[PDB]
Amino acid sequence: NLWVTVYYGVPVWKEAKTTLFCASDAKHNVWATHACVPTDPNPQEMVLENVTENFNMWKNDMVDQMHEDIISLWDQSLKPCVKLTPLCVTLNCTNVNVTNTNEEMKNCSFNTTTEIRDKKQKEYALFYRLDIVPLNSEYRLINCNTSTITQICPKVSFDPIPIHYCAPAGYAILKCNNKTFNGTGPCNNVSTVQCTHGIKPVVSTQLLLNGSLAEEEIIIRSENLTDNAKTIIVHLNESVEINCTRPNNNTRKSIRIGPGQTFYATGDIIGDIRQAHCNISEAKWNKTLQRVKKKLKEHFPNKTIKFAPSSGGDLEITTHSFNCRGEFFYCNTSKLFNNSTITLPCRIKQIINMWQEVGRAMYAPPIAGNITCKSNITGLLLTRDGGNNTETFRPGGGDMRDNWRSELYKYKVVEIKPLGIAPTKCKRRV
Amino acid sequence: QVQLQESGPGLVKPSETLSLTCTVSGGSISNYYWSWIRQSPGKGLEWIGYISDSESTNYNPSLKSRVIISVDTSKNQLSLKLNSVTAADSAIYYCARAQQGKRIYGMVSFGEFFYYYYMDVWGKGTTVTVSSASTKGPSVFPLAPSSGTAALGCLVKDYFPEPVTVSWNSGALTSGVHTFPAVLQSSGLYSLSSVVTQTYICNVNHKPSNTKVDKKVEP
Amino acid sequence: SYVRPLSVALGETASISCGRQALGSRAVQWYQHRPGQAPILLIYNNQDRPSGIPERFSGTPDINFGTRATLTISGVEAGDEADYYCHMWDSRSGFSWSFGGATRLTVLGQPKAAPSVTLFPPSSEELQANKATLVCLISDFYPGAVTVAWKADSSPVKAGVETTTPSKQSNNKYAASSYLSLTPMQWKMHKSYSCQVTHEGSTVEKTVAPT
Amino acid sequence: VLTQSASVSGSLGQSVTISCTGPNSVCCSHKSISWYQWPPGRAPTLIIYEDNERAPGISPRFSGYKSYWSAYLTISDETTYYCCSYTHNSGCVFGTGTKV
Amino acid sequence: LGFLGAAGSTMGAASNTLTVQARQLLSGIVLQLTVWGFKQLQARVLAIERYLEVQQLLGIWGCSGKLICCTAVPWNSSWSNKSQEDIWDNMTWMQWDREISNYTDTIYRLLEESQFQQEINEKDLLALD
Amino acid sequence: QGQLVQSGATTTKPGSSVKISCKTSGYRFNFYHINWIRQTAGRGPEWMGWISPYSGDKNLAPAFQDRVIMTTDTEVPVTSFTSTGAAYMEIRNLTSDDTGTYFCAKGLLRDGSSTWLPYLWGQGTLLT
Ligand SMILES: *[C@@H]1O[C@H](CO)[C@@H](O[C@@H]2O[C@H](CO)[C@@H](O[C@@H]3O[C@H](CO[C@H]4O[C@H](CO[C@H]5O[C@H](CO)[C@@H](O)[C@H](O)[C@@H]5O[C@H]5O[C@H](CO)[C@@H](O)[C@H](O)[C@@H]5O)[C@@H](O)[C@H](O[C@H]5O[C@H](CO)[C@@H](O)[C@H](O)[C@@H]5O)[C@@H]4O)[C@@H](O)[C@H](O[C@H]4O[C@H](CO)[C@@H](O)[C@H](O)[C@@H]4O[C@H]4O[C@H](CO)[C@@H](O)[C@H](O)[C@@H]4O[C@H]4O[C@H](CO)[C@@H](O)[C@H](O)[C@@H]4O)[C@@H]3O)[C@H](O)[C@H]2NC(C)=O)[C@H](O)[C@H]1NC(C)=O
Ligand SMILES: *[C@@H]1O[C@H](CO)[C@@H](O[C@@H]2O[C@H](CO)[C@@H](O[C@@H]3O[C@H](CO[C@H]4O[C@H](CO)[C@@H](O)[C@H](O[C@H]5O[C@H](CO)[C@@H](O)[C@H](O)[C@@H]5O)[C@@H]4O)[C@@H](O)[C@H](O[C@H]4O[C@H](CO)[C@@H](O)[C@H](O)[C@@H]4O)[C@@H]3O)[C@H](O)[C@H]2NC(C)=O)[C@H](O)[C@H]1NC(C)=O
Ligand SMILES: *[C@@H]1O[C@H](CO)[C@@H](O[C@@H]2O[C@H](CO)[C@@H](O[C@@H]3O[C@H](CO[C@H]4O[C@H](CO)[C@@H](O)[C@H](O)[C@@H]4O)[C@@H](O)[C@H](O[C@H]4O[C@H](CO)[C@@H](O)[C@H](O)[C@@H]4O)[C@@H]3O)[C@H](O)[C@H]2NC(C)=O)[C@H](O)[C@H]1NC(C)=O
Ligand SMILES: *[C@@H]1O[C@H](CO)[C@@H](O[C@@H]2O[C@H](CO)[C@@H](O[C@@H]3O[C@H](CO)[C@@H](O)[C@H](O[C@H]4O[C@H](CO)[C@@H](O)[C@H](O)[C@@H]4O)[C@@H]3O)[C@H](O)[C@H]2NC(C)=O)[C@H](O)[C@H]1NC(C)=O
Ligand SMILES: *[C@@H]1O[C@H](CO)[C@@H](O)[C@H](O[C@@H]2O[C@H](CO)[C@@H](O)[C@H](O)[C@H]2NC(C)=O)[C@H]1NC(C)=O
Ligand SMILES: *[C@@H]1O[C@H](CO)[C@@H](O[C@@H]2O[C@H](CO)[C@@H](O)[C@H](O)[C@H]2NC(C)=O)[C@H](O)[C@H]1NC(C)=O
Ligand SMILES: *[C@@H]1O[C@H](CO)[C@@H](O[C@@H]2O[C@H](CO)[C@@H](O)[C@H](O)[C@H]2NC(C)=O)[C@H](O)[C@H]1NC(C)=O
Ligand SMILES: *[C@@H]1O[C@H](CO)[C@@H](O[C@@H]2O[C@H](CO)[C@@H](O)[C@H](O)[C@H]2NC(C)=O)[C@H](O)[C@H]1NC(C)=O
Ligand SMILES: *[C@@H]1O[C@H](CO)[C@@H](O[C@@H]2O[C@H](CO)[C@@H](O)[C@H](O)[C@H]2NC(C)=O)[C@H](O)[C@H]1NC(C)=O
Ligand SMILES: *[C@@H]1O[C@H](CO)[C@@H](O[C@@H]2O[C@H](CO)[C@@H](O)[C@H](O)[C@H]2NC(C)=O)[C@H](O)[C@H]1NC(C)=O
Ligand SMILES: *[C@@H]1O[C@H](CO)[C@@H](O)[C@H](O)[C@H]1NC(C)=O
Ligand SMILES: *[C@@H]1O[C@H](CO)[C@@H](O)[C@H](O)[C@H]1NC(C)=O
Ligand SMILES: *[C@@H]1O[C@H](CO)[C@@H](O)[C@H](O)[C@H]1NC(C)=O
């Protein structure tokens, strides 16, 4: 005969959905990493031998929590900064003089308030063509008939830094270490950790930057791959560099909408008039895109696949809409999707609406000219269209949650069920 | 290698067409750019225009409404025309060989360059005067010497307009020739001199009036 | 008439600046315009010189945007004394159709020269045309600052004098002429005529008499 | 060299016994005994392992006994039966043939 | 020997290494606004929340302060008729948790009902002289 | 608790060799060993050898430690407790008395003293 016996602390876990917190390394920043608890010095990797666990990168909640964290992280940091609402005055934009007639920036003058309803000033600025819309000459900001506009503080740095995502006690996160895991399904060589690795929040389009590289062979991940309306994330087994620059020596005017509200506009270009651009190695891209074409052919009955630019997306979808050392770039990617280097024509906009929100309008202060960013293409973001006997893959974006799924694909949260009940021949007393 | 020669009238009444030709020798006209420049008394240099090897012109914005530059590819001759002339257009007109210059500061794909033009081979330039006054041949008189060394001269009295090419013994006598600058008398004419410190012959070529006259000097 | 002067000592090194400062990456041309002569192209590309122009002339290369175009002239001779224009071709100004402001370079510290005066009586055929003109030729003097004074016998004239202005020769010296119109009756009655030229604080007199 | 009980006859509902003994090298005190229901040509089935430990899905109709010199298998309430002797690291030392 | 290392091991092997999971159970596997301060505060409250309710069941049962703990409830064959070595030497704890998942809540009630009677019995036995 | 399937009649002649396939289903392949048992008519049932798909450990019979070798393919998992594996078997020095049905057996337990014991068998594969 047998009797029930209580075992406390048995390796049993349930599902997910808890409250994850932040973690940062040794150290001002934007992502509130000062309030992030210090990341433990050495991590705690330990393999769960004989354990096969079912993952689901597209139904993960760490992404939905991070995507909500990043959105909430921006609004909390935008409150005390200067709002450019009084900057919606009539802009008497003209033009910036060049030497070559074969624009991108305009010279706009306007009135603003100085000391409240008293004397005003007639000051000028240099706004990009994308930041301005004519009302026909006459001009105004692109987002004033939409909703409120506000400027981010220059005292903050929106550059991506490692953000370790931890689970509290009584919970854990599982880590799939199989090199060829296609994002969903079972996985072996599973390990357990308390915090994720150094995940940098990179917001880009069509190209994944500074992400974790794939190992062994190239990896592809999607949902219903037969469904063309579902987005496709591509991993990179060999990285492709990309150096993007803005070769203009901008100036930073400090005009005052007193009291305290000081708006920093673009002063005057000192030097030559050049255009922003992204340098990618054509010999590296033509071979790397050829190896993605190989893995693409494996997921289809030997169907030759074509690449083409975007369809009808906005400026943030049809172009590699990423961010460098301050300014926001929009590189026309019709060249890569059709032995030396390739160069893209990148535009710059200052008043953007990130995450495609209603009510949001940020202003990126001008950087003091000659900005250079060294990046690393570690992924892609493709879509498909329709349903003849060839396949066309176009770059897409839209939802920024896919950016966080590309790094949180191998993580799922699990709680702990320490209670263990099992029978063994063991009794007690009266 | 390349030689130039500005063959012009020398004096044209106001409100007329100004003909002027510049002949080349060792250089072809369908290969390089050619620019005309004028320099006014009391003013600076006025770049007028230029023509390309493709025979296309571009004029200075101040006088774009007048200047017309042509090309005669039969010979090496190139000409210009300037209508509605006034007393302010009288100056020295130069002929120069212009070279194209591409200054690239960025990448050629996004443009980021500009074309600058420089002239390295110039001409002597011809004199042009604008006045309703007529032309007059000069009066040549011989300045006789008198008794270390000595010197004799050749007076040129009352002509219009500038200039007058002066020679001695028809280019033979070279050293010692000292042709002085003329003077604008109150009557409105110029009068220069020439002195040289076997007989001597004074050579006065007055092309604006075509009057060539030769005279000798002997006490 | 907008010309800006500049005085540089003999033997020293000149530093001719350029007006209308560069707006971006620029390619300048330096022209040496001698007064009433043909301009000579010294510099066509900031630092490049055609064959025949010595090393003494040089500009400033537009390497890093910040410098300014200057034409340095080392070992200044008396022949380098002329006008200097600065053609400005940059990346922010369009077709620069006009040359720069003329820099009137003047070389200081040159050896002075005493003039060589020559007085000519009226020509033989001139009196046959009932017109007489006294010609006083002054050459090889520096600086160009001579005042001519005509004297009939002992009394001055200055009645009908038509004097030129000092023009520079090919010898780096100046030369001027002085004319005086006479009637064959006026020149014949006076005992003698004189052409007094007062250069610096000295005066030289040349005399002619009807014989 | 592992001897069994030759051939055993049975009725309906009674209990028969099958033996499984041998030398001191493969039997019996220091070994584990297992039995199998094996029709020659079909896939066999495990009946009892580790002396008298029953196999999953086996009725209490079966049981096992193990002395210091032999091990026994008894049915209660067809085809052939075999026995094996084994430790924890080696293999199976099969017996002979015994039909019931 | 680490956290959850024997998750795929047999229950007999995992029963020997159950102190590691109970050790690092309140501490991890080793005053600002609501951005991170309030989110991590409510996060660590869930840590002790998931901990006390498991320590609560050990309290009402006769297991308060024990890792292994025997009782007096007989094992019902309706829960599982599996061999004693097919459980401890052939089955993992999560694979075993699924078979009883239907009958998990019944044993919990039966564990505390049996122990309360054990209490009232020891109370009656200590009332003597 | 699963299902093991082998290959069909693969009859050659003496001196040759052959490989019998054996695929698994319904259970974790690396959790239990794979045994091999033949039954020649002249002899009796004779156990051959077992191998662990988890550590690659081998244990053969002394009579078959010369002409017998067996391999195991790694796991192709499906769920947390089920997977698909494979384990074949080759023998050399074949004769006319190595003829009989060959079985692919699954291990009994995962721990204890009776873990490698043949529990789940297959449909049987004849040989010459
Ligand atoms: C991403 O990818 C992007 C695209 O791939 C990439 O963009 C690149 O950006 C860089 C910016 O740094 C660009 O670099 C510039 O290039 C300009 C062009 O240079 C090329 O051409 C010249 C000249 O060639 C003509 O002239 C010579 C005579 O000198 C002839 O012999 C030639 O045949 C030719 O002339 C014929 O051909 C023309 C058409 O081609 C015809 O139109 C013409 O009529 C004739 O028929 C070469 O000399 C250049 O370099 C060569 O030599 C070097 C070794 O010295 C080699 O390394 C090289 O490979 C070549 O072999 C090159 O081929 C440059 O003019 C420019 O540099 C000037 O400008 C900058 C900014 O304005 C200045 O700061 C700099 O100092 C330079 O100024 C000098 O030159 C000007 C004009 O001559 C002078 O006015 C000035 O005073 C100064 O003079 C000094 O020059 C020398 C010392 O430096 C020396 O002579 C003296 O000492 C003097 O003082 C600049 O380098 C590059 O072009 C872009 N790429 C492309 C494809 O366009 C980007 O970088 C990538 N990365 C990122 C992060 O984005
Ligand atoms: C993950 O999952 C795998 C597979 O399910 C687990 O591996 C199994 O582990 C159990 C126990 O740990 C094993 O049972 C034992 O089997 C040995 C037999 O091996 C001995 O004999 C071999 C033949 O001569 C010899 O090659 C062996 O040498 C090595 O063997 C293994 C390599 O796998 C290694 O671990 C050894 O240390 C040797 O280096 C070895 O000599 C048997 O001896 C054992 O019996 C003893 O222990 C039991 C208690 O377990 C006791 O009751 C006995 O009386 C005796 O004292 C025991 O039966 C099993 O064979 C493994 N393989 C399977 C099941 O396929 C692994 O443990 C899991 N790990 C985790 C972390 O979950
Ligand atoms: C994807 O790719 C990379 C990821 O690394 C990013 O590109 C890098 O971005 C960082 C952050 O902007 C750059 O780092 C910067 O370097 C500048 C140069 O530093 C030199 O000079 C200082 C002067 O003292 C030396 O001390 C130093 O050792 C170097 O020699 C610094 O001036 C910058 O410092 C400023 O910011 C930091 C952090 O906010 C402050 O602490 C400083 O006080 C100062 O304000 C800065 O450190 C780096 O140069 C970039 N390139 C490379 C190759 O790393 C991309 O941005 C990233 N994301 C994309 C593309 O979206
Ligand atoms: C965008 O537009 C604004 C105005 O709408 C413009 O600001 C103007 O900039 C110019 C410089 O380019 C300023 O003009 C200068 O003012 C100073 C003040 O004294 C003068 O000294 C300057 O004169 C010098 O330069 C002249 C150049 O030809 C010479 O001719 C002269 O002799 C002097 O050397 C010069 O006139 C002007 O005052 C401002 N105006 C305002 C209202 O700010 C700005 O430059 C434009 N930006 C771009 C990139 O085009
Ligand atoms: C786990 O990692 C192993 C590494 O050997 C890898 O083989 C598994 O993927 C399987 O590889 C097989 C090749 O031996 C292949 O035939 C099989 O289709 C493939 N299965 C899957 C699901 O990719 C890796 N498994 C997983 C689930 O990532
Ligand atoms: C805000 O104003 C913009 C002006 O650009 C509106 O957008 C344009 O609307 C007109 C008229 O409907 C269209 O013809 C253009 O194609 C639109 N262009 C763009 C870029 O949107 C916009 O609809 C206005 N929004 C609100 C809320 O008033
Ligand atoms: C870009 O423009 C700035 C001016 O806005 C330049 O900064 C100047 O640098 C020089 C030398 O380093 C200093 O003497 C000046 O005082 C600086 N100006 C100011 C306003 O600080 C800078 O050099 C320019 N850079 C390039 C590459 O053109
Ligand atoms: C982007 O910039 C990086 C560095 O800024 C370049 O990396 C170079 O890689 C080559 C490898 O063949 C090295 O030999 C060089 O030394 C690296 N550069 C430096 C500065 O160390 C990379 O090639 C650039 N890519 C493009 C497309 O421009
Ligand atoms: C990026 O640049 C390419 C050309 O370099 C653009 O492609 C052209 O698009 C127009 C339609 O707007 C077509 O009529 C042309 O035929 C295209 N050219 C080529 C070569 O395909 C493209 O539109 C640009 N991207 C964006 C977003 O404007
Ligand atoms: C972009 O990718 C390259 C290649 O992976 C990185 O280059 C490595 O940089 C690290 C330092 O961060 C060095 O220790 C390695 O030796 C470099 N390897 C190679 C092959 O160059 C580069 O650092 C990445 N860019 C950034 C900004 O980190
Ligand atoms: C804009 O400015 C220009 C001169 O800078 C002026 O002539 C024009 O009238 C202005 N336009 C308006 C609408 O004020
Ligand atoms: C406001 O703008 C108008 C025309 O745009 C101008 O006349 C007026 O001076 C400006 N206000 C001030 C305070 O300068
Ligand atoms: C499992 O992951 C660990 C991570 O360090 C690695 O060392 C090990 O080789 C991996 N095992 C397999 C079978 O891939």
Ligand SMILES: *[C@@H]1O[C@H](CO)[C@@H](O)[C@H](O)[C@H]1NC(C)=O
């Ligand atoms: C990923 O692999 C699993 C293997 O079980 C398969 O079921 C699933 O359909 C795959 N998904 C994609 C997007 O390839």
Ligand SMILES: *[C@@H]1O[C@H](CO)[C@@H](O)[C@H](O)[C@H]1NC(C)=O
């Ligand atoms: C994928 O899309 C197809 C439509 O072609 C649909 O029939 C199928 O059910 C979808 N798969 C899933 C898992 O929803």
Ligand SMILES: *[C@@H]1O[C@H](CO)[C@@H](O)[C@H](O)[C@H]1NC(C)=O
């Ligand atoms: C990346 O994938 C290709 C296959 O297209 C392979 O040949 C290459 O070796 C992989 N990269 C590395 C570093 O192994």
Ligand SMILES: *[C@@H]1O[C@H](CO)[C@@H](O)[C@H](O)[C@H]1NC(C)=O
């Ligand atoms: C400007 O950027 C270029 C491109 O990297 C670099 O070579 C140069 O040194 C930079 N100059 C300054 C002053 O930062």
Ligand SMILES: *[C@@H]1O[C@H](CO)[C@@H](O)[C@H](O)[C@H]1NC(C)=O
């Ligand atoms: C076992 O559980 C059943 C519930 O189906 C119940 O009827 C029976 O009385 C229980 N027996 C014991 C001994 O607990």
Ligand SMILES: *[C@@H]1O[C@H](CO)[C@@H](O)[C@H](O)[C@H]1NC(C)=O
């Ligand atoms: C639990 O009970 C439900 C309902 O009777 C049944 O469908 C399910 O299979 C049972 N699960 C187990 C593991 O006994």
